[PDB]
């Protein structure tokens, strides 16, 4: 990078860059050290250790369902970087930008073997699996849905684009968050699938190697939002919202030794001061941009989205239990529904209670125009949460959604 | 007039006017028909009449914590106003402005003896109380806060003013309601105080005649907003918010006979169609202002409110149980606090569940500062919610209040 | 043992008569013996002593949800009757008919105390409640809908009438026990309202005496149907239906000593062997007429109904595990629903799962008509399930009601 | 588009005719388009594309176990027929009638190869199997019971005859689809015997063409019933039954583009709108007679049956998740059982759970008679369930069969 470690597409890496990361985590993996892989995992969920790392009832950590979410996870990736160079990660933990239709799957983390046979090495792509220690099983993803190589009625017109872009449109940090965070979940799910020990499970994603690679990109999106904020005229590290959490540290990052042998994360635990990453954490992205759209190109695209009447459904997420996913559709008066959109929440047991202080908006303008329906009409919205396993979830007490309207 | 009634303050009510009114409800109070007083009372709460009078588990029947709240309560006064009409009234249901500091509690409804001219009579003040029949009980009032009688750092800048005015600084209807309603909640308590049977108890609170009086000033100022919105450029009769509910016919009004003999309110159960009062209900307010400044002077006021940094506490109101009061204090790092502010909610144990889909912000600016406190100063915030009875209710699971900051 | 008995209405009871029964159960209720009250109480459901009385997992021995229900409960009133006799009774167990709107609560079972009145002295009305020793608890009551009195959109046609009359229409023993049972569910509800230890709970209900009182009026209908059929041309005592189970001994009446010291009760445990009560069980009814109408008049009243197009909703009952109650409305394409009817089951932790082999029908012609609708027009139809202890039951997994059309 | 079609028997087919269809499907089977074979194949069950085609948990879109089954499969033969036409076909999809003992296997679908024979040349018989691309597998067959040929304790009365004849007796649309479906189950079994990828599996079966062939002979009976009824006095196109679902659009035929490029198919997705095939779907049958017997002769043959006491067993089907087959005998009190009958369902991992709202009946008079037994005598009745892949299915939890008696 500048010195700043540069985080890049796990895709356009160097045979060398790659190699380094391979040996790196390979080592990292059997680093029984407090700041060794396997204990880092114990941060995000199981074994939990948050109220304290051993007090009464152990809630797991990882600010999920709250504002101070990205800050937490931001420390975590770095907590993994300032962890790879411990093993000579010649570079910064690369990102797997799911935001774009990926036909073939990135080989960096799909291969189960790796012939360093040119050099002296020939085995498993450590960046393709790990072993859950205490819970003695194997993270084994079930991508199941490789329709993460899907839609785009216009090509780039895909889920994540719609998701992030909107997220990005938000100017109030907190508005941006709920949305930003829901896209996070997508990939948690799109990979863990219907399996237990995997990326689709609060308690276990940490264990899988791709975790880093994804949050690396989510935190790359986060960055992308700061940068756009700056371009809009706002201080990108200014959070005037939720100023009750930002000051409160961030466990265990704040725990110090001997659970976190890092000092920067430690010193930088109060989210408040974790926004401007480049300073406190020297690392950066090669291209703060979304799907080859310049920061000015993004802004600009957004304001063109604003050029017309739009229609959204609001979601009051209170989420609890295991992570689940939900579909919703626009039923017409005699009952003519159309799949309108979907989203998923990550979660488990030890999750720490959470309820968004606000709605999760989700555009439906299109599905509506298609079906010849306007905001002046009678149409009802219908949902069905569903567990990470064929278990229909009662959509009863679950507050019905609003149906916002954003003119101009 | 032909196709309108006019609403004045109880305090500008010429004996002429109030005479009509005294004999009106008096007659009303004796109307045993489905659109006579007693009847026209449960429409609110007890006895339950809402899923359907015939249903098994029955809830209240009035929209609370919900964007359609004002329209319902607005539709309700029309219901009363129309009965008085049917009973020799010649004026609209007067509003008891509680905005301005009350020197004493108005005559119209305070004394309990209507003597006066023409008939040379001498009998009870119908507008001073009725009595709950089904319950064999009788209405009550307990103004344990009459110190509601003028507080105000700089004079006319009083609580409910502070309150109702913020609310007006808001063009996102839902945003304004979640504030416009908490305001309204105050009198509900300022009057019933602690009487299990009174303006302070979701259930019987519709039987005391102030209900109407009060709910007329609210309806008043709500009309105000509309007006104000006009002066801001927006369509004062369009709500591009919560449309999923702005369309569900408001019961009982949507019941028609034999529960609701009034036609122009079935014809209007849809909130959607309750915004245009003068026109669908033909009833006007004498004036449209709030404590002095006109619609304009209003707009030309709030702005000033926006010329300085402000600091709010947001409250995530899931509300449920019985009516109850919450007060909150800012606590300095050390251990001492200062009374922050306080709001209250009205709520029977016969209410349909309800949780707001947005935070309920309230200003702690000054207080904070008058405590040598900066928006960026390490400080906590403890809350207290006690019933109307006096059981301290454990907030152990009440979501901690945020601490929003505000630019400009 | 020797002598017939004539069961009378719980109103045309002569103080001599009443006296014999008052003193009888009084004695019964102190009969510690296996054929004593607290014990005969057990036969229905709790303490369960079912497949056997000693095996690991046990259930409430009573038949519910199955074809063979009316026999089980028939043997049971006999079991109790013979027992009342054994203690001095000399009249059959009276029946509290409720197809007729009760304007008050029959003395027999309501007085808190009774007066020998044939020697004058005070004792508590044994037919007014009882203890429940194993549970160390006491029955209780709650006449919930004493609004049962409240009935008759056109006179005597009360819910139960419509309800039983229909059951009497069906000429197939099976198609009819569907209705006849679901009818025998109402009093259960209307006497135990929300109280856990009462009639509304499979477990304790047979602990309260009004059960005997009820199930005597049901068996009164069962005999009556037996007339309507004989009058119709059929041999009462045989059924062209369900023969798979009409011969499986009923428990525990079959056990014999030591859980059933009664021999007629046992020897006649096979339901087929109990259709001709008087012959097997010496006992008859003062009268067999619903609303005082002849078996002939019934056969007339029915066909007369067989004269218009009707319309019914279809219910596939299965039974939760707790007594519940659902009422279904019948919303228009508009979104304006309209209460149309209801029924309730009698569930219980300790039951043996059951589902009726056919649908339970329930006419909606009328409600339809009074809404400008008919079988060809478009209408939807909604349900809402509630537990006895106010607790909405998820109806998500509840096969939707079908809507029939019956010509003639 | 324009022109009627007459569906013929798969035997009285003229080489010209056959030719048009042979070349047609041949073409069809190479139609990669949404309305191509491999795709139209999907409509039934696998690949599932059901509630919607993109939501998380998906099911086989086909209706089974429900009232609305005969329409679904009716729209489906049309969906395929129009498609055969689109490729050159000019005759309706023939029907392989099997109510009549097939002594051989009809050429149409059996020759491994065919000879243009109207220009002479070899091509493979497209109506003889197909590939199944998604599964990367190929249909297969196993005529298991080519012992189907084997039938007739007294001639033409083959299992299917007894079976269908009965379905035609019932005059209630619903009571009859119970039989009519369970009948449409036999060929499924008798063609796919033990082979996983064949007709005996909900998933793949519509992949083999003889399905079309079958479901054309079923729809042939469905029309026939429609005669017997019209002849009986009823309006074919309406049903006095199940109206709750006769108007719920069938999937995916309703979807439209891009999963159903057919418009008649969609526009007529509501089952009510499909009873009068010829009118909606241009197409008829050469004949409508079971065993060559007139609609009149049927109405005669039936009543004639309505002339003796019969006896039936009762089955409450629910459906496992896999196609199964059970056969019930009817053991004496002796311990000497006697095969009495059987039937089989068509299950599948991917189904939408269903249970019939009523029992499925199946007569045992005869077997009873030939054993010196009748409805009053004592006899028990046993079942044995086996999977297609030899695997005894636990019948422990399977509501026992009831045994009816039908006089007249
Ligand atoms: C995976 C691979 O490249 N194949 C090699 C194989 O050619 C070789 O015979 C062997 C020596 O034991 O190691 C294998 O498994
Ligand atoms: C059996 C074993 O150790 N696995 C080897 C692996 O090391 C090597 O990378 C691969 C290609 O040479 O050949 C496999 O057979
Ligand atoms: C003369 C009279 O009765 N009318 C009074 C008036 O003097 C007073 O100014 C007004 C409030 O400003 O209230 C009216 O009722
Ligand atoms: Cu996380
Ligand atoms: Cu209210
Ligand atoms: Cu109110
Ligand atoms: Cu019972
Ligand atoms: Cu005496
Ligand atoms: Cu099928
Ligand atoms: Cu030739």
Of the CA atoms within 13 Å of residue B371, those in its CB half-sphere come to 23
CA–CA distance, C336 with C331 (Å, rounded to integer): 5
Helices (H) and strands (E) in chain A, counts: 11, 12
- Chain centroid, CA C71 distance in Å: 11
3-state secondary structure of C125: coil
**What's the token pair of residue B103?**
């020197």
Polymer length of chain D: 408
**CA terminus-to-terminus distance, chain B:** 46
Neighbouring C-beta atoms of residue C299, cutoff 10 Å: 18
**A327 with D248: Cβ contact below 8 A:** no
- DSSP for B57-123? S----S--SSTTHHHHHHHHHHHHHHHHHHTT--S---B---SS--SS--HHHH-S-B--TTTT--B
Q: Listing from the earlier edge strand, what are the strands of the sheet with C360-363?
A: C360-363, C310-315, C402-406
- Pick B56's closest partner by Cβ from C325, C335, C336: C325
Of the CA atoms within 13 Å of residue B408, those in its CB half-sphere come to 6
Closest Cα partner for A164 from A226, A101, A225, A234? A225
Of the CA atoms within 13 Å of residue B87, those in its CB half-sphere come to 24
**What's the token pair of residue B30?**
């004796």
Closest Cα partner for A79 from A40, A34, A21? A40
Measure the CA angle with vertex A298, ends A293 and A303; round to 5°: 145
Q: Which of the listed residues B9, B12, B13, B18 should we mutate to test ligand 3's pocket, taking the one with most ligand atoms within 8 A of CB?
A: B12
Nearest chain A residue to D248 by CA distance is A335
Residue D303 near residue D278, CB atoms below 8 Å: no
- DSSP for C145-197? -GGGSS--TTSS--HHHHHHHHHHH--SHHHHHHHHHHHTTHHHHHHHTT-SS
CA–CA distance, A319 with A323 (Å, rounded to integer): 8
Contacts of B161 (CB under 8 A, 6+ apart): B99, B100, B290, B291
Measure the CA angle with vertex B159, ends B153 and B162; round to 5°: 90
CA–CA distance, C327 with C406 (Å, rounded to integer): 22
Chains A and B touch (3+ CB pairs under 8 A): yes
In Å, what is the CA distance from A122 to each residue of A106, A113, A118, A287?
A: 20, 7, 9, 33
Measured in Å, residue A77 CA sits from the centre of ligand 4 at 11
**A241 with B316: Cβ contact below 8 A:** no
- DSSP for B211-245? HHHHHHHHHHHHHHHHHHHHHHTS-TT---S-TTT
Kindly give the interhelix angle for B210-232 and B159-168, rounded to the nearest 10 degrees: 40
Q: In terms of DSSP bridges, do strands A137-138 and A283-285 run parallel, antiparallel, or are they unpaired?
A: unpaired
Give which of A339, A341, A395 to mutate to test D binding, by max D Cβ within 10 Å. A339
State the closest ligand 2 atom to the C-alpha of A113, by its place in the atom list counted from 1: 9
Closest Cα partner for C144 from C325, C322, C11? C325
Q: In terms of DSSP bridges, do strands B379-387 and C113-115 run parallel, antiparallel, or are they unpaired?
A: unpaired
Largest CA distance in chain A: 69
CA–CA distance, A70 with A215 (Å, rounded to integer): 9
What residue owns the CA closest to ligand 2's atom 2?
A123
The experimental method, as deposited, was: X-ray
CA–CA distance, C338 with C368 (Å, rounded to integer): 9
Q: In terms of DSSP bridges, do strands B379-387 and B324-332 run parallel, antiparallel, or are they unpaired?
A: antiparallel
Neighbouring C-beta atoms of residue B253, cutoff 10 Å: 25
Contacts of C271 (CB under 8 A, 6+ apart): C68, C71, C72, C245, C246, C247, C248, C250
**What's the token pair of residue C168?**
């009497």
Q: Where do the structural domains in chain A lie, given as residue ranges?
A: 1-307, 308-408
CA–CA distance, C402 with D177 (Å, rounded to integer): 15
- H-helix segments, A259-334: 264-267, 277-280, 295-305
Phi, psi of A8 (to 5 degrees): -135, 165
Residue numbering of the annotated binding site of A for Cu cation: 44, 64, 73, 184, 188, 215
**C336 with B54: Cβ contact below 8 A:** no
CA–CA distance, A83 with A70 (Å, rounded to integer): 19
Residue C271 near residue C247, CB atoms below 8 Å: yes
Residue D201 near residue D323, CB atoms below 8 Å: yes
CA–CA distance, A178 with A241 (Å, rounded to integer): 13
- Nearest ligand, CA B18: 3
CA–CA distance, A400 with A403 (Å, rounded to integer): 10
- DSSP for B135-203? TS---B---S--TTS---TTSS--HHHHHHHHHHS--STHHHHHHHHHHHHHHHHHHHTT-SSBTTSTT
3-state secondary structure of D396: coil
- Chain centroid, CA C176 distance in Å: 14
Contacts made by residues B23-28, CB under 8 angstroms, sequence distance 24+: B23/B88, B24/B84, B24/B87, B24/B88, B24/B89, B24/B126, B25/B84, B25/B87, B25/B126, B25/B127, B25/B209, B26/B114, B26/B123, B26/B126, B27/B87, B27/B88, B28/B83, B28/B84, B28/B87, B28/B126
Closest Cα partner for B48 from B252, B232, B235? B252
State the closest ligand 2 atom to the C-alpha of A115, by its place in the atom list counted from 1: 9
Closest Cα partner for A43 from A388, A350, A356? A350
- DSSP for C251-276? TTTTT-TTT---HHHHHT-SGGGGSS
How buried is residue B307: exposed, middle or buried, by Cβ count under 10 Å (0-12/13-18/19+)?
Answer: exposed
Task: Assess whether the C-beta atom of A14 lies below 6 angstroms from ligand 2.
Answer: no
As for chain C, the residues directly before each break of C–N over 2.5 Å are 3
Residue A346 near residue A64, CB atoms below 8 Å: yes
CA–CA distance, C289 with C294 (Å, rounded to integer): 5
CA–CA distance, B135 with B38 (Å, rounded to integer): 11
Q: In terms of DSSP bridges, do strands A5-9 and A283-285 run parallel, antiparallel, or are they unpaired?
A: parallel
As for ligand 3, residues whose beta carbon falls within 6 Å of it are B 12-14
Polymer length of chain B: 408
Region D1-307: CATH code: 1.10.1280.10
- The alpha-carbon gap from A317 to the nearest alpha carbon of chain C, in Å, equals 20
Measured in Å, residue B13 CA sits from the centre of ligand 3 at 7
CA–CA distance, B326 with B384 (Å, rounded to integer): 5
3-state helix/strand/coil string of A241-265:
CCCCCCCCCCCCCCCCCCCCCCCHH
Which residues, listed in sequence order, are joined to residue C34 by a DSSP beta bridge?
Answer: none
Q: In terms of DSSP bridges, do strands C113-115 and C6-7 run parallel, antiparallel, or are they unpaired?
A: unpaired
Closest Cα partner for D109 from D205, D8, D216, D211? D211
Residue D85 near residue D27, CB atoms below 8 Å: no
Q: In terms of DSSP bridges, do strands A324-332 and A379-386 run parallel, antiparallel, or are they unpaired?
A: antiparallel
Residues of A in contact with D249 (CB under 8 A): 335-336
**CA terminus-to-terminus distance, chain A:** 43
Residues of A in contact with B376 (CB under 8 A): 243
CA–CA distance, D16 with D338 (Å, rounded to integer): 50
Give which of A384, A385, A386, A396 to mutate to test C binding, by max C Cβ within 10 Å. A396
Polymer length of chain C: 408
- The residue written with tokens 């990882």 in the block is A62
CA–CA distance, B151 with A56 (Å, rounded to integer): 48
- Chain A positions touching chain D (beta carbons under 8 Å): 147, 325, 327, 329, 335-336, 339, 342, 384, 386, 390, 392
What residue owns the CA closest to ligand 3's atom 11?
B12
**What's the token pair of residue C275?**
């259709």
State the closest ligand 2 atom to the C-alpha of A122, by its place in the atom list counted from 1: 9
Q: Is D44 annotated as a binding residue?
A: yes
- Chain centroid, CA D273 distance in Å: 21
Closest Cα partner for B305 from B201, B173, B164? B164
**C335 with A396: Cβ contact below 8 A:** no
- H-helix segments, A128-240: 159-169, 173-192, 210-232
CA–CA distance, D314 with A331 (Å, rounded to integer): 39
Q: Compute the 3-state secondary structure of chain B and give helix, strand, coil in percent, each to the nearest 5.
A: 30, 15, 55
- Pick A405's closest partner by Cβ from B240, B359, B399: B240
Nearest chain A residue to D58 by CA distance is A390
**A355 with B399: Cβ contact below 8 A:** yes
3-state secondary structure of C249: coil
Q: Give resolution in angstroms.
A: 3.3
Kindly report the CATH class assigned to C308-408: mainly beta
What residue owns the CA closest to ligand 2's atom 8?
A122
Residue D68 near residue D254, CB atoms below 8 Å: no
Burial D319-347 (b: 16+ CB within 10 A, else e): bbebbbbbebbbeeeeeeebebbebbbbb
- The residue written with tokens 């609403």 in the block is B7
3-state secondary structure of C299: helix
- Nearest ligand, CA B202: 5
What residue owns the CA closest to ligand 3's atom 2?
B14
Nearest chain A residue to D252 by CA distance is A338
CA–CA distance, C158 with C164 (Å, rounded to integer): 10
Task: Assess whether the C-beta atom of A405 lies below 6 angstroms from ligand 2.
Answer: no
- Chain centroid, CA B166 distance in Å: 15
- The residue written with tokens 């026209």 in the block is B40
- Chain centroid, CA D1 distance in Å: 27
- The residue written with tokens 């409430």 in the block is C60
How buried is residue C408: exposed, middle or buried, by Cβ count under 10 Å (0-12/13-18/19+)?
Answer: exposed
CA–CA distance, A19 with A122 (Å, rounded to integer): 12
- DSSP for C86-107? HTT--S---B---SS--SS--H
- Pick D357's closest partner by Cβ from C242, C359, C375: C359
Residue B193 near residue B144, CB atoms below 8 Å: yes
Q: In terms of DSSP bridges, do strands C324-328 and A122-123 run parallel, antiparallel, or are they unpaired?
A: unpaired
**Torsion angle of the four alpha carbons B161, B166, B169, B174, in this order, in degrees rounded to the nearest 10:** -120
Residues of B in contact with C325 (CB under 8 A): 56
In Å, what is the CA distance from A180 to each residue of A343, C110, D96?
A: 12, 65, 58
How buried is residue B58: exposed, middle or buried, by Cβ count under 10 Å (0-12/13-18/19+)?
Answer: middle
């Amino acid at each position: 990078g500048h010195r700043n470690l540069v985080r890049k597409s796990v895709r356009n890496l160097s045979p060398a860059e790659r190699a380094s990361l391979v040996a790196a985590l390979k080592s990292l993996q059997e680093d029984s050290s407090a700041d060794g892989f396997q204990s880092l995992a114990s941060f995000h969920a199981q074994p939990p250790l948050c109220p304290a790392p051993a007090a009464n009832k152990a809630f797991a950590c990882c600010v999920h369902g709250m504002a101070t979410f990205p800050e937490w996870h931001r420390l975590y990736t770095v907590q993994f970087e300032d962890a790879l160079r411990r093993h000579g990660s010649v570079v910064g933990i690369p990102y797997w930008d799911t935001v774009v239709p990926q036909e073939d799957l990135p080989a960096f983390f799909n291969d189960e073997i790796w012939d360093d046979a040119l050099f002296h090495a020939n085995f498993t792509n450590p960046f393709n699996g790990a072993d859950i220690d205490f819970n003695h099983q194997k993270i084994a993803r079930d991508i199941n849905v490789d329709k993460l190589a899907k839609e785009g009625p216009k090509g780039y017109d895909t889920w994540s684009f719609k998701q992030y872009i909107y997220a990005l449109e938000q100017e109030d940090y907190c508005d941006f968050e709920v949305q930003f965070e829901i896209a996070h979940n997508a990939i948690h799910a799109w990979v863990g699938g219907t399996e237990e020990y995997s990326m689709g499970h609060l308690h276990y994603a940490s264990y899988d190697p791709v975790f880093i690679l994804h949050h690396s990109n989510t935190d790359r999106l986060f960055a992308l939002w700061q940068e756009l904020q700056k371009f809009r005229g706002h201080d990108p590290n200014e959070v005037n919202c939720a100023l009750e959490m930002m000051r409160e540290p961030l466990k265990p990052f704040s725990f110090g030794a001997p659970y976190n042998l890092n000092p920067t994360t430690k010193e930088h635990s109060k989210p408040e001061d974790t926004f401007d990453y480049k300073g406190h954490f020297h690392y950066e992205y090669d291209h703060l941009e979304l799907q080859g759209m310049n920061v000015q190109r993004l802004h600009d695209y957004i304001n063109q989205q604003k050029e017309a009447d739009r229609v959204f459904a609001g979601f009051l997420l209170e989420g609890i239990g295991t992570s689940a996913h939900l579909d919703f559709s626009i039923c017409a008066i005699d009952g003519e529904c159309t799949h309108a959109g979907y989203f998923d929440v990550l979660g488990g047991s030890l999750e720490t209670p959470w309820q968004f202080d606000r709605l999760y908006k989700y555009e439906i303008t299109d599905v509506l125009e298609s079906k010849g329906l306007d905001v002046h009409d009678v149409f009802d919205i219908k949902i069905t949460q569903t567990s990470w396993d064929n278990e229909d979830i009662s959509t009863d007490r679950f507050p019905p959604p609003s149906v916002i309207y954003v003119p101009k």
